[PDB]
Amino acid sequence: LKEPVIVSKMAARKKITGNFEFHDPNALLEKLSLQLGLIWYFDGQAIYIYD
Amino acid sequence: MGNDISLIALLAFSTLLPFIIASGTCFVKFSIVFVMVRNALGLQQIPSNMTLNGVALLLSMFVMWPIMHDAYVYFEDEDVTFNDISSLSKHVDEGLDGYRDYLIKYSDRELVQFFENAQLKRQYGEETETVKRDKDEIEKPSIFALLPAYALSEIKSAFKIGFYLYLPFVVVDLVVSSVLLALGMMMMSPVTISTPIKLVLFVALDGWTLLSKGLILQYMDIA
Amino acid sequence: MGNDISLIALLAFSTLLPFIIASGTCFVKFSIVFVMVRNALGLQQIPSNMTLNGVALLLSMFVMWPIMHDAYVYFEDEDVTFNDISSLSKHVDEGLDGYRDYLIKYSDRELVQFFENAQLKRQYGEETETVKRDKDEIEKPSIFALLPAYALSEIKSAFKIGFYLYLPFVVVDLVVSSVLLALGMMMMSPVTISTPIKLVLFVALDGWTLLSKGLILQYM
Amino acid sequence: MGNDISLIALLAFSTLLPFIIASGTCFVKFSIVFVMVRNALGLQQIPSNMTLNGVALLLSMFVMWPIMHDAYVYFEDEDVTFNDISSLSKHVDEGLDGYRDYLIKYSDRELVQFFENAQLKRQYGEETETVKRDKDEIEKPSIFALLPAYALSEIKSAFKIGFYLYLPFVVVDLVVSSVLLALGMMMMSPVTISTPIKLVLFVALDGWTLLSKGLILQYMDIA
Amino acid sequence: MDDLVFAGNKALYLVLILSGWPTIVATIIGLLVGLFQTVTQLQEQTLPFGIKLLGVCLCLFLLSGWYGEVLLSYGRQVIFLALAKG
Amino acid sequence: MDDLVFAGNKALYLVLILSGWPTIVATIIGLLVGLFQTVTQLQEQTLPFGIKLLGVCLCLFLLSGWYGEVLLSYGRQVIFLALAKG
Numbered sequence: 001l002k003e004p005v006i007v008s009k010m011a012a013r014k015k016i017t018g019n020f021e022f023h024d025p026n027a028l029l030e031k032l033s034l035q036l037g038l039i040w041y042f043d044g045q046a047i048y049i050y051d
Numbered sequence: 052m053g054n055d056i057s058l059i060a061l062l063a064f065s066t067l068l069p070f071i072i073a074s075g076t077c078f079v080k081f082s083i084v085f086v087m088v089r090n091a092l093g094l095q096q097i098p099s100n101m102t103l104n105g106v107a108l109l110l111s112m113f114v115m116w117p118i119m120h121d122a123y124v125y126f127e128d129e130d131v132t133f134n135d136i137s138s139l140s141k142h143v144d145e146g147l148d149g150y151r152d153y154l155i156k157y158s159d160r161e162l163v164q165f166f167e168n169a170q171l172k173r174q175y176g177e178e179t180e181t182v183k184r185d186k187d188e189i190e191k192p193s194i195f196a197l198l199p200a201y202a203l204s205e206i207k208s209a210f211k212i213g214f215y216l217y218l219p220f221v222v223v224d225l226v227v228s229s230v231l232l233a234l235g236m237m238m239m240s241p242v243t244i245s246t247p248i249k250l251v252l253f254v255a256l257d258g259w260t261l262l263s264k265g266l267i268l269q270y271m272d273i274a
Numbered sequence: 275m276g277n278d279i280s281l282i283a284l285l286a287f288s289t290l291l292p293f294i295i296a297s298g299t300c301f302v303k304f305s306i307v308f309v310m311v312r313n314a315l316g317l318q319q320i321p322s323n324m325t326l327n328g329v330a331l332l333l334s335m336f337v338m339w340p341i342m343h344d345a346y347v348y349f350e351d352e353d354v355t356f357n358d359i360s361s362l363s364k365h366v367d368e369g370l371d372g373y374r375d376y377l378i379k380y381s382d383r384e385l386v387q388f389f390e391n392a393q394l395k396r397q398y399g400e401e402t403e404t405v406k407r408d409k410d411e412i413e414k415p416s417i418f419a420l421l422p423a424y425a426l427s428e429i430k431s432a433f434k435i436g437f438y439l440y441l442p443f444v445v446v447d448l449v450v451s452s453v454l455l456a457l458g459m460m461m462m463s464p465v466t467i468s469t470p471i472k473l474v475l476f477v478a479l480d481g482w483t484l485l486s487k488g489l490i491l492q493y494m
Numbered sequence: 495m496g497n498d499i500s501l502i503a504l505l506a507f508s509t510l511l512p513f514i515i516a517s518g519t520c521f522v523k524f525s526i527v528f529v530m531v532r533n534a535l536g537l538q539q540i541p542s543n544m545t546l547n548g549v550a551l552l553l554s555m556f557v558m559w560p561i562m563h564d565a566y567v568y569f570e571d572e573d574v575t576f577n578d579i580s581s582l583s584k585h586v587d588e589g590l591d592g593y594r595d596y597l598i599k600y601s602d603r604e605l606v607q608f609f610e611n612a613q614l615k616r617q618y619g620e621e622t623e624t625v626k627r628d629k630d631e632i633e634k635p636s637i638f639a640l641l642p643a644y645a646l647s648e649i650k651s652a653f654k655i656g657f658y659l660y661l662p663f664v665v666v667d668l669v670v671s672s673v674l675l676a677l678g679m680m681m682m683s684p685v686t687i688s689t690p691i692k693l694v695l696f697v698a699l700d701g702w703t704l705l706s707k708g709l710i711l712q713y714m715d716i717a
Numbered sequence: 718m719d720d721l722v723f724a725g726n727k728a729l730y731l732v733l734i735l736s737g738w739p740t741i742v743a744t745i746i747g748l749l750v751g752l753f754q755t756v757t758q759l760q761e762q763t764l765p766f767g768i769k770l771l772g773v774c775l776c777l778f779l780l781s782g783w784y785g786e787v788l789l790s791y792g793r794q795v796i797f798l799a800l801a802k803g
Numbered sequence: 804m805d806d807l808v809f810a811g812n813k814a815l816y817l818v819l820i821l822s823g824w825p826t827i828v829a830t831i832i833g834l835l836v837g838l839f840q841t842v843t844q845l846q847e848q849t850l851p852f853g854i855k856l857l858g859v860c861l862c863l864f865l866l867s868g869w870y871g872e873v874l875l876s877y878g879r880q881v882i883f884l885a886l887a888k889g
């Protein structure tokens with residue numbers, strides 16, 4: 001992503017496992033947001049992720 | 052103070068302190084162990100309860116002080132001011148975790164969960180679970196759930212220690228009574244003779260030093 | 275602050291609160307049971323009453339919390355319109371039914387009905403044929419009838435639990451006395467030999483957890 | 495009168511006074527010794543505890559007075575007014591040295607040092623090691639360490655004394671039984687005869703005078 | 718009250734069988750050592766006590782595991798009855 | 804008044820009745836075993852205890868019921884005498 005990522009302590013209680021690729025971080029981020037129920041934003045400096 | 056409600060909360064906590072100390076701190080253990088020692092030695096009046104409790108309180112102070120200090124240094128920072136209810140609430144919550152850790156280290160989770168499910172009215176209060184699934188339950192558990200579990204978990208521990216401490220003296224009693232029967236002095240009560248033997252035995256072991264050290268070492272570690 | 279006579283009523287209630295807890299809540303029962311455990315183990319001063327009561331008070335909150343929450347949201351959060359004596363009286367009374375039902379669940383009918391008739395004081399000395407031990411109800415007894423019947427039921431339940439708790443420890447020490455009389459050692463008292471046995475028996479049973487769990491399970 | 499905070503400190507001290515006397519003073523030793531003597535003579539109600547503790551409190555007052563007087567005179571002195579926190583705090587500290595130096599003679603070095611090690615801020619690795627020179631370490635360990643070590647060492651030394659006090663009466667109790675068996679009166683309880691012998695022995699020995707004198711001699715120096 | 722009847726009767730039965738075994742052993746040893754003194758016509762107070770002590774200690778070393786099983790079983794059972802109604 | 808005297812008398816009377824049977828059997832067993840030990844010379848002393856424990860427990864089993872009926876009837880009686888005045 002080339003950006004620092006901030007994750008809420010409510011979201012950080014969810015878990016994941018598996019083998020992943022990061023060919024296109026933005027698209028992967030969107031798919032996982034809708035599969036896990038996250039919401040995210042970007043202010044130009046850091047990415048923020050919440051439940 | 053900068054906030055009247057902060058002031059109110061601080062004074063309330065200061066008013067409840069002695070019941071928290073008596074119900075959520077190692078004082079629960081140390082208080083009991085010394086009284087069991089006195090009973091096993093067979094002494095009625097001496098030392099005084101307030102002597103024993105005074106020592107117990109001093110020792111517990113060392114163990115608990117690091118947490119109090121951490122929380123004070125955390126809370127006295129005015130470095131951030133709060134946009135909203137949730138931001139404040141989370142800031143406060145994250146401060147208790149130094150205490151919450153200590154309770155969760157020593158209580159036993161099956162009670163904690165049982166109480167959690169009980170204060171919620173959920174599924175009529177108790178129901179079966181087909182599946183067993185653990186959900187980082189360490190961070191979920193409310194302090195109002197943790198406190199009783201800690202209390203019971205530590206009372207039991209005290210009884211265990213007292214059990215072990217009784218055995219050596221029981222040996223002395225039965226031995227004295229048997230050698231008096233060997234002499235045929237059947238009328239004479241052992242307690243006239245067995246007591247001093249117990250006294251010198253404890254003095255030679257230096258039981259107070261070993262006992263006090265070991266109690267602390269269960270919680271801290273020191274060179 | 276709304277109506278100030280409602281303010282006076284709130285401060286009054288807040289002042290009486292500890293006696294209501296002490297006489298109309300399962301604190302009554304938990305407090306007794308834990309002290310009897312200490313007596314059955316034969317310990318005179320440890321754990322402190324400060325500790326035992328602290329535990330009992332905590333546990334009872336779990337049981338009572340569902341009721342206070344409902345009463346709060348019913349009275350304070352909901353704005354409502356009411357305009358006369360009868361409408362207000364009915365509104366207020368209806369809020370208490372959540373607690374009333376708990377008392378009637380844990381109280382004994384013939385005694386509650388006796389106190390009701392005693393406070394009407396009507397035609398008094400009414401006979402046992404004025405009653406026929408009916409079973410299913412839509413009666414709504416007074417709370418001043420329900421409180422003491424509750425207290426007097428809880429106490430009896432506690433005594434009953436205390437009966438069973440003594441038995442194993444009674445066995446444990448008559449065995450010790452009999453073995454000491456099988457030997458010659460009749461000059462020596464059992465107590466200093468008997469106490470540690472009771473302490474191990476109790477920890478092996480983990481009695482504190484079984485007690486707390488089972489006490490809670492009755493009210494679920 | 496004076497600094498409002500100095501007033502608060504004086505009143506707090508005077509509120510905690512009886513727990514200090516009960517936990518960090520020779521009263522601890524004398525209280526135990528007298529009760530043990532009563533048990534050695536085998537009396538369950540004579541003298542009253544209210545008499546024994548009264549005597550013990552008076553005897554302790556002599557030993558403790560000179561320190562209280564010296565510390566009082568040290569603070570009732572207009573000599574200076576203070577520029578800074580470090581000057582004031584070191585002036586305060588230099589006033590307690592008389593008491594600190596009383597506690598140091600009787601607490602035990604190894605236990606004291608263990609408690610001082612216990613207070614230091616925790617570290618994630620085991621704490622960084624140190625050795626410190628005598629003017630802190632020998633001369634000036636902290637009072638929150640000295641105090642419980644004192645209490646424990648005093649209790650121990652008290653039990654030790656009680657042990658020696660029991661021995662002659664144990665001798666009596668045995669001899670008298672053996673003589674009754676030599677006369678064949680096997681069924682008579684020997685307590686009925688041993689008790690008065692014990693009393694005779696104690697009055698002819700004048701045990702109260704000896705105990706009261708020697709206990710004071712352990713702390714005072716009299717010529 | 719079949720529950721009170723059961724718990725009360727079992728308490729006494731347990732006292733009787735828990736205590737019986739040591740006293741039986743002690744009595745049989747007592748009789749045999751009392752006899753041997755008669756056929757030998759040789760007499761002292763201490764020999765029977767000395768042997769009885771060993772006999773009872775062996776009895777306890779052997780049976781004590783079962784004493785624990787029996788007491789735990791009864792301990793659980795009475796608690797469940799006390800809190801059975803709910 | 805006479806109710807007081809009557810109730811107090813009855814208390815002693817019930818003590819006597821209930822305690823009487825166990826103490827009788829413990830006496831008879833004491834005499835028989837003591838005689839037997841003179842008829843054949845054996846100097847044991849726990850044998851009486853071993854037998855009389857079984858003797859007393861057996862009759863506690865037998866009388867367990869009548870004991871509770873008597874005490875209930877007495878309790879009801881004295882509660883009536885205390886409260887039913889008019």
Ligand SMILES: CCCCCCCCCCCC[N+](C)(C)[O-]
Pocket residue numbers: 446449450471474475478784785786788789
């Ligand atoms: C008078 C007999 C006492 C025997 C011990 C009674 C049970 C408590 C202690 C042993 C418990 C069994 N356990 C857990 C060690 O296996």
Ligand SMILES: CCCCCCCCCCCC[N+](C)(C)[O-]
Pocket residue numbers: 444445721722725726728729732867868871
């Ligand atoms: C082990 C000695 C003490 C045991 C006490 C048992 C009390 C039982 C009380 C009920 C007796 C009358 N019964 C059997 C009709 O219920």
Ligand SMILES: CCCCCCCCCCCC[N+](C)(C)[O-]
Pocket residue numbers: 225450453454777778779781782784
């Ligand atoms: C003379 C000692 C009398 C002890 C009475 C209790 C005996 C049963 C419980 C202790 C059993 C000890 N054991 C055999 C496990 O080591």
Ligand SMILES: CCCCCCCCCCCC[N+](C)(C)[O-]
Pocket residue numbers: 221222225471474781782783784785786
């Ligand atoms: C010297 C007499 C000591 C009697 C008490 C001994 C401790 C209780 C027995 C613990 C072990 C119980 N057991 C054998 C079931 O494990």
Ligand SMILES: CCCCCCCCCCCC[N+](C)(C)[O-]
Pocket residue numbers: 725726729863864866867870
């Ligand atoms: C050493 C035993 C002393 C027992 C004294 C009490 C006797 C009554 C026991 C309750 C009635 C009989 N039973 C069998 C139910 O226990």
Ligand SMILES: CCCCCCCCCCCC[N+](C)(C)[O-]
Pocket residue numbers: 718721870871872874875
């Ligand atoms: C020590 C007196 C004799 C033991 C019996 C004491 C009364 C226990 C209660 C009796 C209850 C009778 N029952 C079961 C019919 O209700």
